[PDB]
Each structure stands twice: as C-alpha cells, then as structure tokens.
Design a protein around this ligand. Structure first.
Ligand SMILES: *CC(=O)Nc1ccc(NC(=O)C*)cc1
Ligand SMILES: [N]
Lengths: 17, 175
C-alpha cells in the first residue's frame, strides 16, 4: 500500500495507543 | 448457480481463515482471482458491504479522483479490520475517535465509511466516535474477517477498474 496511506494509518493507530 | 455460489463461498472462507490465522497476511491478485473473476452479481459478491452505495453515492467528478478518495478510505477501513484480528493490538482498540483530522480526511471523506466500522463491531455511538459495547470483551473474529476481506476486495476491484483490467470489467462498469 502507498506510504502516504501508511502515514494516515499511523496517526489513527496512535489514537488507539 | 450452485457450483458457482459454492466456489465463491469456499474461496471466501479460505481467505477469511488466512486473515484469522495471520492478520498481516497479504493477498496477491492471483489469490483473489476466485472472487474477482466470479460471475456472481454485485448483490451476491458483497454480503456485508453496501458496495453499491459506497461507489455510486461517492461518484462525484472524474473516476480518477473519487475512486482514489474511496480507495484510501477502504485501505484505512481494511487496516482497522486487520487491527481487530491482530492478537497484539494497541491498548485502546475498543474505540475509534472521529476528531482526528486524518480520520476526517480519509474515512469520513466518503459516505458510508463510518458505517463500515459498525460491521466490525464498533456499534455503540459516541459524541466523538464509535466503540464496542462495554460488555463485549473480544471481537467476533469470523465477522471481522469477512468484512475485512470484502473491504479488501472492493478496493481491489476498484483498482482493477482504474487500470482498465478487471476480469469482468463489462458488468461492473455500471458502478
Ligand atoms: C508519513 C508519516 O510518517 N506519518 C506519520 C503520521 C502519524 C504518526 N504518528 C502519530 O500521529 C502518533 C507518525 C507518522
Ligand atoms: N496508548
């Protein structure tokens, strides 16, 4: 998957930590 | 008919099982070909995702653009599903918070994106998002697997329509 989407997901994954 | 319906459902469980066994498992196009090349109509291909509305109700502008916006949202929703299937999750997986500007610009940028999270189990409405029922302590693995596969498949089918390479592009060009 494009790295730009992985940037998005990492921000959302942060919200769950 | 029956053989085609059976092959489709069996192929779905093979992939859903792989996701339940390994949430990080990636699938190639060839491993998804049983579902992409299946002659089943759209209502039969997607049992959980309202894929008709997801595409048609976000079809604003050039297909190059709103298929990309929808692809990003589906990509993120897939990772939410894989996250619930991961045996190692972040501590507060039980709630999704909408206020995140990255959520607002990806999932909340398409109609129906929020509703997909409900199919994972994020069913209780919050002012700031959606969460699991406090009684439910673990997610329905089989349900999450099926939705995750459908979200993965829908993004895949959209990408193959984008490159003019869907095996059944003719019938699915209606979307
Ligand atoms: C491109 C990239 O590295 N993006 C990115 C976004 C978010 C986060 N982390 C948090 O928001 C906590 C890291 C990296
Ligand atoms: N966290």
């Amino acid at each position: 998957d494009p790295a730009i989407v992985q940037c998005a997901w990492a921000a959302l994954y942060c919200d769950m930590q | 008919g029956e053989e085609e319906e059976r092959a489709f459902l069996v192929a779905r469980e093979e992939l859903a099982s792989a996701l339940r066994r390994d949430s990080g498992q990636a699938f190639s196009l060839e491993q998804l070909r049983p579902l992409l090349a299946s002659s089943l109509p759209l209502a039969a291909r997607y049992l959980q995702l309202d894929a008709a509305r997801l595409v048609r109700c976000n079809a604003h502008g050039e297909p190059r653009n709103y298929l990309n916006t929808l692809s990003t949202a589906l990509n993120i929703l897939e990772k939410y599903g894989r996250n619930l299937l991961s045996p190692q999750r972040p501590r507060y997986w039980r709630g999704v918070k909408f206020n995140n500007p990255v959520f607002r610009s990806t999932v909340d940028a398409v109609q129906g994106g929020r509703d997909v999270l409900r199919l994972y189990g994020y069913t209780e409405e919050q002012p700031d998002g959606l969460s699991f029922p406090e009684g439910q302590e673990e997610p329905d693995e089989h349900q999450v697997a099926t939705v995750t596969l459908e979200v993965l498949l829908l993004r895949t089918e959209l990408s193959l329509l984008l490159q003019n390479t869907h095996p059944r592009q003719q019938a699915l060009e209606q979307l």
